[PDB]
Design a protein around this nucleic acid. Sequence first.
DNA 1: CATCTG
DNA 2: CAGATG
Length: 327
Amino acid sequence: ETLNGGITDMLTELANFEKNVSQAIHKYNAYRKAASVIAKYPHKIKSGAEAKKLPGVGTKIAEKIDEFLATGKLRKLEKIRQDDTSSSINFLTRVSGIGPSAARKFVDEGIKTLEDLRKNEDKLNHHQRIGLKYFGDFEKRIPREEMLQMQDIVLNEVKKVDSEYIATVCGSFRRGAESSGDMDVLLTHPSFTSESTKQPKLLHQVVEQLQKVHFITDTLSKGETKFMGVCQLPSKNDEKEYPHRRIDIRLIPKDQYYCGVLYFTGSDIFNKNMRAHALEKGFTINEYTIRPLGVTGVAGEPLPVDSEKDIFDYIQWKYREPKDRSE
DNA sequence: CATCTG
DNA sequence: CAGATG
Ligand code: NA
Ligand code: NA
């Protein structure tokens, strides 16, 4: 956690690079388990061979670990941290919609910057385009104070559309967090579930409402069960308009809400531990359900949940307010 | 995993 | 349809 800090870090750099610039998914994937194991490793890595000793650690990584230990540096790391080409890919990638794949193409067409992009807005697709248009806004954290107003709107709108809506704002927003990245809304309706064959409208009626009033600004992706878009808190008495923020809305069959809602709420840590305990208590839990564990190895069948409460109960645990869902 | 693009 | 992004 701090004993083999740098090592795990350098490695993550390397790994990252492999995958991002080169297309080295193996290599990439290599640094990963690597940092993972030295990461757990209880001692102070005093040398390569010592590390080597570990699984995932080969000769090549060992090599690298030496020079790093030997000198507060790594050539290759240094060589990569300069190199324009590499730098560009790490940068383009910042745009919503640009991935590494795309980052590569662009640079190889000489688009390596923000301007480059605008100049070539023709080569970008809708998502990507927006992504560019909102570069700044998109990187700006979302202060809970805005979050609450947003939440205030979404809910009221969903409500007017149909009393049976059940919306929820998961995320850290939910866990207490002073600021969040994007807004994530979980959605369901009674008339929607596991068997119940569809109801796309269910999702589209609200999307529309939100656009009605202007909360929703652009559409990134709109499917029948998942919507990816952009929203905005009406700028008051003109002088201060708000940044644009990412917002997602997903439909969920009523019979699977709480697990989703639990799940989405996090933290990743909370989950696991909660997930591990579930297992002890003879249970299984994932994104959508809680299933009693057979002894023959494994086994299913969906337990029935009417709240986040139903779940814990099952695993026979202390109900946890979202706030302490930390770890 | 669900949506898009081409 | 494979392949990309989130
Ligand atoms: Na990106
Ligand atoms: Na292939």
